[PDB]
Amino acid sequence: MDVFMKGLSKAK
Numbered sequence: 059m060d061v062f063m064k065g066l067s068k069a070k
Contacts, residue, residue, distance in 0.1 A: 060067035 059070065061070040
């Protein structure tokens with residue numbers, strides 16, 4: 059997924 063990091067992809 060992409061929500062853990064504050065900057066990676068943000069797909070949530």
